[model samples]
Target chain A: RPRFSFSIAAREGKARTGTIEMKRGVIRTPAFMPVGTAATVKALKPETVRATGADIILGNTYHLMLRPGAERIAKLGGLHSFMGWDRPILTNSGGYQVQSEEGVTMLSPERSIEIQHLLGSDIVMAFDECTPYPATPSRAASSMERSMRWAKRSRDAFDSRKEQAENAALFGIQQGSVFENLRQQSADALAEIGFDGYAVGGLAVGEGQDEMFRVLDFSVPMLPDDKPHYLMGVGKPDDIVGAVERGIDMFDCVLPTRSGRNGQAFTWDGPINIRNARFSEDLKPLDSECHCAVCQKWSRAYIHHLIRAGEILGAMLMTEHNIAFYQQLMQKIRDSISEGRFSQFAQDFRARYF
Target chain B: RPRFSFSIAAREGKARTGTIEMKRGVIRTPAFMPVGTAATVKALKPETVRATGADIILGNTYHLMLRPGAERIAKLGGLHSFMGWDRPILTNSGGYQVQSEEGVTMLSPERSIEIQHLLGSDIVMAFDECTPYPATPSRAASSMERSMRWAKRSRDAFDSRKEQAENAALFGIQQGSVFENLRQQSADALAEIGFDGYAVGGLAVGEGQDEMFRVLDFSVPMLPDDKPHYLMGVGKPDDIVGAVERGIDMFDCVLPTRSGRNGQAFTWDGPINIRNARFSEDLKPLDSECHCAVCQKWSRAYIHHLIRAGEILGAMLMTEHNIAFYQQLMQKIRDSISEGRFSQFAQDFRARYF
Candidate 1:
């Protein structure tokens, strides 16, 4: 894996603290990236996101390629310079679009593979078919086969980048739709084809949590342990904690950002809807202990009025707070792994956070 | 007139710096209150407005009564508590709405007088016709006479509130429709009524600059110098400078707040419309010499994109910038008066600020 290599900084039980050394920069495991769908992070400037302690952001190769045109971005000096953001951007190969799709047509492997390359991603994603859950075994196996072919195409396209190919890394997604054996086969095939990272995909699509966990436990062992494991769109506080407990390293989702906008703020004691009437007169901060500016400066009363009034500042403050929530939570997870208190920390977080 | 009295701090020629001391707080003269017309400063939170050095906000009883209803606010708590703003708020009488209309059945002095007293305005205005500029003498006379009666009624109601009388003050507005004798006459009658302050009403009513100034020159002199002279809705940068030169001390307008949402900004080199193409790639601040978060961290290109995309953050950033601009401009004006260099400061500002 050249300079883009992973090394365990510490390990406590099943949880571990590691460093992901990429050509652009190093990402500490259990790190969180604020999702910036287009070039922008919705309302926030890139610097503001960085100010909130974001080291990386997940950018959509699909949206960027469609709107700004990937070739135009390449002409303008790639995603980083074009968006005025000079940080590691993990480009998801539009797989989430298909995984949660009502219907899908043009996003086939051949098309998505080429588009991801043109967008110039640092950590590229394999164009895999993420078959949703509640599927029969035969259908799940067919989807996994298609995903395997797509992963091969993604490797071939990313390989043609020469210098970028040397610097950037690609993650192959295993899409077995909660079938353990299918997941195992997909994972082993991706491992055979070779990838810098492996993602447990086709989850968070209404599959029972137990099913997702079952597949993750078995499928994770099939991939090379040297490579990082990603859980695509696996979410909520307990979900992240559980995945990390099972040895997953990288995770991505829009939960924090979306929930913030909807007034459901993630706090240590579960998510609190700031717009709830009971909070109208409460003088409490969103999180008294956390140091996010929104939590520190604004009262629940003020933010409630803002949220109720449909003010953008509400969205801005809440989104920043939620993102801060994840980043801080990840820090706790990393700290516990390094300090040899992984199990205790996970139990404590689950007990307090829902 | 009692504690909140104006004392000349400096005089930069005609650009004067003075402070208005009221029981609520001290407001530096030539102050620009962020117009919270609808009980909100558009995108700005009251604290954010105050953080930019604003000591007071302008609220309209008209908008309040029409929207949430005055009784609703009193039930929720006074305007200060209801809006989450603790600072002094100057609530306008519905009179301005009268002038902006032709057939205002709601313009009756009896009902309008009750509205202000019920709203519990800290600085209540005498309900007068904003006397649509270029008014026929007969129409102006009718409006003036009706406002005078309303002014008397407003004072009686205010005085009757022996409980909150000292807590709030009354300001009588002189409306003569750019006519000299009518201006003096209206001012004299109001002076006899002996309100705490006076207002120069009906300038920015499309009468243009020449007529507006002519009315102000005679009208302001006719009013009591001991009271704070408010120029209602009199506008733009140059307009303020000119009004301040003639001893006008307070002003409220919608330009700063409204223009902000539309991407217009007040800068050192005059008004820079952010919607203009010239700012597309300009990497400089909104005003290069000043400091504001929007100007400091983000570039014109980013703002341009936000505006084009119809992002709410564009309005937030632009509104924040404008309020900061208005507050800073007020500070500069106060500084000029304190130094007795108001004239020189005015010349310099006009030369550069347009």
Candidate 2:
């Protein structure tokens, strides 16, 4: 059997439905990989995460390397065994960092690839500098050019590890910070060198939705049609819908989990704060439409009380529901795309959500 | 059918195996009610708490009355529906308080009873002042007498609500610090007042284990044999064992849940801090002998990393395992008593634990 493979099952306009098959599991796209930074998905258990229809989760190379250290994770087995997450894991490269805070722990392409290998990542992202938003075309070109060089080094380092490379696939990130020509150049360079997948990076970095969509309009098409197209850090339900409409296959973000811990919940009618005074006596679930364990069993009033009291279960319940909501949204997107109604589905979703 | 009933199945020395039959569920004794202070078992879900073999959980009246208010919970369909726990919930009376802090929110016996009724508690504890440790005989006597008067008022208030009284059982608290005679007097006064159960309170406050045991030696025999004897806010594994051996049938404490959040775990060999540097590379379960979901899946190293990183899942995992350990201990104790080998079991446990 092949170690990694991607097959498009169906498509509605630019929206596509497919699966990324790996040794650990099959990730149905457009997939939303919940961020499990620091080895756990905030307050949720691995089983609960899997129960939310997540076939894969994202780990942070930077955080893992800093605290537990990549070598320690490998020595204790790997990220999968260490965190008890048996399914596929997609780890971000440690290229995303604060230089002064990182200090001596600065990550180069080889070092980032080495950490991912140590963590036994199933889907390894390339070490690329995230181009800041509002950059001049010249500055963006320089940053994107540097990232392209780093991408080559990351690929070389990944190829050096024969055993690890066999089971895992490397992904090269395209960084141009909303510049059409630079994005095309980065994509062309990555395609020339080659990778298992391509990621549209540096878009969701404080650029407004209009700017992000404008960039995605031209940027996504330049990537290879045969491989998966990932949109790193792409978020919110509407953001996901728009990205899916633009041909993105995979996404990873912390909004759902992070917002959950802060007493915010995403629903069909948009996000609601569970800590609000109105919910103190409201007996509804976080999302009335959500059938997750949290929504099915708990009330908004209970979660409101828990959050107001700063209870741990509040974070646990909220995070669980938000993750479940995200997965449910993905499932809806996939179903709509498969049935050739993705356009209408996206229209209805935005109408209700916004 | 009776609202509540206790039946002793077997006994070994003073240790007994029994069950408390209530409308919601039957709690097998000697039962360890995990403290669900603010409508939650700290970081655990109700299902997880039930999975740990907990048939009942404790709720604090004071905390509930403070935030989310008792009336709010009742209006939202009572504490059981509010928190999603379907089984028995034993609520503490709001007698425990800081007077200066309470201000206008003072809890009288009637208010405490009313709050417990509103929360739909299966077992309602009478409101009584927790006498401070190291008080003079006269101070203790005055406090105990005041508690007895409050106990009478609590009973009358509970009885006034005929429908609530039919489904719930009231327990009068015995609050005589360390004086054996005062405890006997408190116990005798409560028995005359007539309650569904009796609690030996004000002992685990600050009294040493030896002193607590000495009080229990005389205190336990004074309570009616037909009624359940609860040791309120009582204790660690060894403290529980000693109390059960002295004929206490019920126990509730926050040690397991609290210690877990602080990175401490209870195991067969005693408690160990998961945050310790030694566990950072130890790939073993929190307790090799236990088979709870947390222990069955997560490694000590993973938990250690999470704790050191201050992750929410760390608290969730640790709290789950510790609660499981406590329930497992209770199950073992019940088994030993039923099999007439409680003495040998206690001896072996103490040998390894202390």
Candidate 3:
């Protein structure tokens, strides 16, 4: 029992199957962590999230710090006890935005690390500027260089809190706006600083799948081979498969949860808008292949009516199924990689999904 | 077994403990039927609703007919399979408004009864205009007379559907603003027309608690004693106890569910607004006495943060506890009556509740 450890059990091409063991729980990778911004997986209960086969969830550092306040959660007994989600929580560093003028401050690396520590994060993310897409090479270079500086600062701040640091693991993020040299520079800098894990950030902002995949093709291999490589905000089912093929070990996205709330459902055939008039009489489940409770017990017709009528249970059921779908997808990804058939699985998945 | 049957188990003064058995389920009286107005109990799953000790839920005929269309629900295998409830559903008649003279049609008694039949309702409410408060004696008399005519029409229409009728029971509503003579006249008309049960309607409209209780004092005994007496849209906690003490056997209202969504919680010590700033730092459960999952696991401080931040889980958690609280109240009411101490229970309940 290590406080935190990642062990790769099997590999197929660049895709690999492994487990990230932590004191709170074990997460199977390539894992898709559901986002629980504001201490909830939207409309789901913690048990419901657990039942969906998610061993870990991602929480936003900024949201918690602003509303409930990290101090408030710590006072009430950490984020786990406060949200009643007693599992490993990977909290992002609150550095999505840059510092502002008029003396209006941003969450510095130290403050962000402190907040994550206060929230009792199991896997703490090093604060880094999320370089926006469509940046010029020079702009991206400057952003990535600044992010590397913040990464070092975050490491120092995280290390200063020795007691909390020992109980948690820190992940340094690589920031470059689809530029290979900047990505390589950012990766080398973070690798030199050395974190327990490494994350390929600044990719999913607005980059198309092909562009993102192109970046991952070269960017992922730049990080240390032994550390878990998380692809931040990486993506749809196909996007996930492609990323896994490119050697990413972890992912977090709001597509499933947010899309579900907006009346879209993911399936083997692709996402469908449940609010469509065509589904008003379609008695089939949202996804014929999904065996989740929502699919097993409710119909497209019913969900259509509920969503159209603006019922909250509609969101609840849809979110439940979408989260389940994402986890199920992850399970298949892990299984394929372990069984040494990930290439075939990825091919068949895209053929049906697209 | 009969399609519908009501049997009193114990009695204390005017209060009685009983069960209303239907094909789908057995409802313990006096039951508080949560309103599932668009085929959903707001933010809850059907199993979650059942977990709250509710054997029956009330659905709105108007909402269903207008949106999914009663026929659409039937084509999709009735409301039970449509909503995944599968338990006894008491659907109200789409007759809350009076027909107008501009040839603007209202749901005729026949159509309303037919919609209930299409919905596969276990307890179908007979169509009647919900009389507004502060009506003159003459106005109330005319309204009650029209309601009586509609009641007969509803019974005739219900009886015409021989196949659907055998699987369901119809309850006629007695309406008459606050006039006792009009109420007595209406009750006699419905009793003569014959229904499986009788409901005291048109009282909880805008009438104060005293006025509503005054109406129930004389009105409850007007219906046949063998039939279950439902006090429609009647109550808060104290109101339910007062109605039960006045011989009511069932109750339904949007207080708990609607209030829960609005950040209000029902407790043994009366209702508390969870959104209040004072509770932002309170680490206690919504109700210390409640052992529901929401209360047993979550804190008022966390709930306060959620509601104020406009999180969906806030509504879900609040609604869960409020519904549980209401059911718990009903259970206590039934238990006290069964134990032959309802009068004492009522005395102590009001002493603490109010």
Candidate 4:
């Protein structure tokens, strides 16, 4: 009703390729949003991130709230102008961040809503504790109950800022550990409260691949089919492929960048660490099949030197390459679905990547 | 003669705008050769340096001798291919580094010449002590004599190397501490040995400004007219201007890049340390009229935060800006000389810079 539009262009089994039309632009899904946690993606230029084919970027309320202060960015012009980025920005509520940062005491639901307002998020996520994988039922339920209470307050806050409704939206995050019944109840509570979109919160936290995929198989369909479905912090090339097969529409992670700067390279033939002595004299592009500015122009040998030398250009170039690889991965997925070869493409990609 | 060429396009008293041709490329006069000590300007990309209009860059014989080793670089296809920088590169002789690192007994004229040979430098300086300023006349004279012997040996060693003879140029260094007559004698002996270029060395090492300039005024005119004049490790914005006015055509220093990393930014309005507390609320560029990329897109507030936060982007952006500033200053000086308005330009610039 608020100019939020999703159009499915093609589908193969449950896998679908589509576009989410917002005022900023049309994001081709399944989309991989580069994380600009602190007004930047560590060492990258925003334009370089866009050139990497990122349709949108995600911001963290926690980091911004702590340093430079979110209120300051809002006053100077929200995250967009503050970061020299003008594309769509999806800002997470500080619930997960509060959990991650040491010494944070969980606040009341009312406080969660108040903090989100103070941040001026573009696509505000309901403050929820991202349930840890293998979490006990009782432990997860307490976390989910706290999150559900915050969800209602988040919706109430959205209603109060009625003006942002057309240009902005609030998405509720459902956290139910890996239990199917709990996931169903969480989804039901979210639908009862109502929201613009639903996100699958709390996976990719060292849970073995087999169990994570099993939970996603059922959990994705429980959320509203029409609204966008995001998989929070879902990662790795193989992980993304399996999650997208179950109809997840969006993802955000720091894997490609962080690992990249740490000398790990995610290539089509699985990940390789550049710091390994094998690449020292191996004059080869990062991924011969893929093309990023770094991979296109520099060799593994040069980057190996930079990393060993502890130079920033090493991190910057590798970060650019990794982010670009993820963006390209999303594009390939969308293309495969549109071409009606989603299953074949996924299988072939995994066979190569894994 | 290896395609050597020169042209004095214009002159303002002793200050001149000209060109020096090498087998690889032509360098515009009054050039600020950005020091790429270890085959890099620290955090910059080659294209970024080229974008700043840098005609040539400085390489270090000392660092190359120790690290990747000159032979390794030559085997890998010379520095141009190794560093991905295809322009004229002026490499310093290992003498200054050798003297600073080791003692006199281990290195004499004979030993230093052999070390320079192993480094395979282009535009290598003759081995000389960057004699400490304020030394007694006898102390300076002894050092100058030792350097004169080293100059002849340097020429002999350079002549013996096929690559050095065919591809690179050798420059003689005149060293006499703060004494004028010794400076003249050093210059005359270097002239007799014959060099493709001449450098007024042994200054800017705690000599202070007046002493350094006084030495230059007496020493610069004694060098041959046809060859390029270099002022080694000679400094700051006003120092460069003043030295150029004394007929020095080339300069190299780590001031811009190193100082930039430490938060010092040079501009027409002099230096502004980004880390200084006053800049927290400034929100202005380093200099309002600066045409560098850092000033163009970023505010002082942003740079200050990056500096305070210890982000790599801060060093990258600031280094690039300083290199651009240095190159632009050189261009401005060249333009003023060509138009015969250098004196007027010098007065106007000094008013803001000094």
Candidate 5:
């Protein structure tokens, strides 16, 4: 069998439901990949994460290479066994530093691919410059070209690993800041070099949602429809729904997990912070529509108490519920796509969720 | 049926196995109550605590009465529903402040009983002074006499509510420091007042296990045999086995849950701290002999990484495993007693566990 393959199962115009088949496991499209930056998903165990309906989770080369180190994880039988996650893992290349002026060495394309190989990643992202949001069109163009060049080097390095490449697939990243033409050029350049999948990077980085949606309108259509289209670091429930309507297949964000730890919960009625005094005596779940274990088993009042008490469990439950909510949202998005009612579903979801 | 009843199923030497039936459910004897001091079992949720094989849990009146308050909990449907725990809850009366000299309207026996009633605790502990260790026999006598008087007031307060008394059972506390004769006097006074249960209090504070066992060797036999004998704040796996051998039936402590938060785990081979550098690459389960979800799914290396990273998941998994370990220990003790081999079992456990 091929190392990896993406096949669209159904489509409602540009919005589609599909699956990415790989050696590790199958990933249903329009999937929400919970960010497991440090091998573990913040407050959740791997099993609990899988139980929340995730087919794949994202690992960050940035954190892993510094902490346990890729070699250390490899020595302990690779990332899968290291974290007890048997499903597919997508590793983000640590090429982009939030502050490029920092003294720390940034990841090169070769090192990023090598690190992904060492960790036995099922889906590896290409190293790319995270084009700053306010960059001039010329600066964005330079960053996008550099990323395209790095994408070629990443693919070459991944190809050298004969055995590892047989099961893992490399993905190139498209970076053009919010410029439509530069994004198109990056996509065309990546398509010419070729990769198993593609990720739309350099969005959701202080760029407002309206600008992001406008960028996606031009950028997503430029990428290959045959491959998975991941919106890297993109999110918020409604943001995701809007992106899905424009054809993004995968997403990884710290919003649900990070916000959860900080006591914020994303619900159908918008986000709620358990620390709010109004929740002190509220016996309702974090989300009335959520059927997750946390919502099913505990009250907002109890979670409020846990959060105020500075208990770890509050974070655990909140993260779990939020992830479940996101995954369920993806499942709903997929169902809508397959049934040819995505537009209506998107409208109704945004109207209620935001 | 009686409001509360303890019936021994089997006896081996002085150690025995029994069960206490209550409004919520029945709890098998030789049980360990994980301390949910502030309406939660520290890092664990109520369901997770139950999943660790706990038939009941302990709540502290001191913590509850202060934060969120007992009346607030009562208005919100009592502690059981308030915390989402639908099991028998044994609430400590908060009668013994380690620093009894502080004057902030210390919990009176009547107030303590009223708080427990408001929390709707399944097993209500009598208010009492925790006789400090190294007390002179006269000091011990005075403390024990005061506790007995408080015990009477607690009983009267409990009995004041006929309907509440029909469902909630009160337990008198026996506090006499380490003086065996004073313990005898304390137990005799409690026997006169009568209660559904009895607790050998003030032993595990600073009294070393040997001294605690010495006190229990004499004091446990002095308490009414038909009542459940809880060793208040009594500890360690070996400490529990020794106490079970000396006729103790119930216990509550923070050792398992507390140590778990600090990365320590209890196992048949003794205890292991996951944060140790030695565990950095140790891929084995936290406890090979145990089968809790943590032990079954996670490696010590992963836990080590979590703890080192200051992630909440490490605390969550560690607490879960330790609680399961304690519950399993209790189960083994009960099984041994029922099979008429508690002495041999205790000997073997101590030989290996310590």
Candidate 6:
């Protein structure tokens, strides 16, 4: 067994609050990992991302392997030292290689595990097909079976790297495309292969949140409850809260940062686009309720000017605020779960935010 | 009298170290004010700019007046509060009004001083035509005489704002082409009009370093020794050292920030363009001896990747590093002067950096 471990501290109606202990740092669940696609969180520094309350960040092996090259980054000194991020980094095995609607082929299971190790990933996700939406039952079953086979190969490849096994954790992905039976088979196969964690993949693809929630309701319990449950590429503030309610512990997404760069800010009242003329002289913070430095120190009018002028500081400030807002949301979710009022918290959040 | 004051602390040969006292903060000379042409310094936050060791920053009267408008910034708060940079800010009087061979005209002296006051400028410059190069003696004389008249108007206009006059200090500008006689006339005229400080302008406009040095040699000694001497829009590391040796005490330019954005990094061995293929795999800091966080934490190879990727973090880090380099240079210049070793420092610097 790896030195990495997970322990649940509290639970309320399947909304669990716990911590994932790793060599780099302790990550509190349900933790939100901001996407640092190319060894960077787009417009932020590693310290700035950490300051936004992130205990862990996700790096894309897909981006790295193509541009700077995993071997180059590894030779330069691994992603953590190269990017100046010392905290735990969760790296996705290069996907988009599987037959996507775009003709993207999925990475081989062995290659995926190898690249993750080269990048010095703290949590390595198994390479699996995204299993494009609108697939027939037969197509979905075949894709699930293939991913199960990849799961075993990914585990075997990761275990082969004996040196990294004790310090790094590998996660398996369950892909069934909204089918309960295939999902169960996928989970059973993954349990047989075994992994340090399990991820609910292939949801939030094009399926609406309602349909996605339906899949997760049946899919989440099929995986081992003792291991950490990660919801890959899983989404907006409300989407995260809803997923947490079903017992998912970790998530990674580009929503907050992407929306921020586009001049949209997530507030307690939902998202507001800062480019609107109304904000030209609003004299208020991006979010009056948030305690982030951008919210505390800057005015909507100032940010409005920067965004309109196409200033990079505008993107930087907006991204910083959005990341802070998301982390604050995760913190509140954890606090609510620990207090045994997860349902009350969700009700209040959706009433105002949704 | 305004609370603002400047006092020479030491003099080694022609180079001097001094202090400019302001209500907000004290600026050590010879100071390099990084150009924050827009309300923000492009990609950097105010604190990051400050962390680069900048004692003050430069704001453009022309840019601010045209974009966000000086009145809007005043209504919200002063530039210091609006931009979150709470330190001395030296503002340039829009100069281009004097019809030139280059078709550059200068800002009206009254409007220039008025805008600076509204922007809450600490050091206000008198509007003067930047007499273009390749001018006849007759054209240079006419331009110098007109600028001196505008200098009086700028002083009267700044003084009329009694409340701002108490907190802000006005500086008169000396404008003449390369002609030494016209330069002396301009300086004498400014001396009669009087200001808290004096600036030698209209030089770094297409005039090569040798021509600029020649002008400074005869012109700088014409300004008052008691007040701070400013050389506006004046230049590279060598340009600064030469100008400082000619007795100039302050400087401002967009060189560092602009070059940084273009992937050029200033080091003791002079500036290197980080986009060059040679640096792609060169795992070294921009400058080996630089005490900046960017140099301390990042490698040239990483910056090379960021620059090539067109990432904003690249611009931010590069600009941060460049600004730090300039400030460090100024600090060393000041220290050398204080210790009466500026001549030795200058010779040593040019040997390696030039």
Q: lDDT by residue for model 3 over A100-127, one digit each (tens)?
A: 3111175778888898989999999988
Output the better candidate (4/6) by DockQ: 6
Q: Residue B90 error for model 3, in Å?
A: 0.9
> What's the residue-level lDDT of B224 in candidate 1?
82
lDDT winner between candidates 1 and 3: 3
What DockQ does each candidate score versus the true complex, computed on alpha carbons?
A: 0.26, 0.89, 0.86, 0.49, 0.75, 0.72
lDDT tens digits, residues A1-354, model 2?
A: 468999999998888999989999888999999998888889988989999999999988888887778999899999999888999999998767534222225677888888999999999998887878789999899889989988898899999999778999999999988778889999999999999999999988899899899889999999998899999998989999999999999988899999999999999999999888888778788887898988888888888889888999999999999999999999999999999999999999999998
As a TM-score, model 3 comes out at 0.98
Least accurate 10 contiguous residues by lDDT in model 3 chain B? B95-104
Error of 1 at B278 (Å): 5.7
Best by DockQ: 2
| Per-candidate local distance difference test | 0.76, 0.89, 0.88, 0.80, 0.87, 0.88
Off by over 4 Å in 5: A97-106, B97-106
Chain A TM-score for candidate 4 is: 0.94
Judged by DockQ cut-offs, the docking class of candidate 6 is medium
lDDT of 4 by residue, B21-103 (tens): 88778889988899887767788888889999898888877776666566666655566766678887877766677643233
Clashing pairs in 4: none
Q: Mark the 10 consecutive residues where model 6 chain A has the least summed lDDT.
A: A97-106
Clashing residue pairs in candidate 3 (N, C-alpha, C atoms within 3 angstroms)? none
TM-score of 2: 0.97
User: Residues B1-354, candidate 1, lDDT per residue (tens digit)?
Assistant: 453466766654334567777776778888887887666788766767888888888887777676557765665566676566776778887756643232256555545555665666667776666666578999898878777777787788677776457677778888878778888889989999998889887678898887788777778878887678899886898898888888788988888888888888888789987778777566666788767766766666556655666766677778888888887887887776776677887889999875
Candidate 6: regions farther than 4 A off: A97-106, B96-107
Q: What interface Cα RMSD is found for model 2?
A: 0.8
Candidate numbers, best DockQ first, in rank order? 2, 3, 5, 6, 4, 1
lDDT of 6 by residue, A241-279 (tens): 999999899998899998899999999999999999898
Using all chains and alpha carbons, the TM-scores for the candidates as numbered come to 0.83, 0.97, 0.98, 0.93, 0.96, 0.96
RMSD for each of the candidates: 4.8, 2.1, 1.7, 3.0, 2.2, 2.5
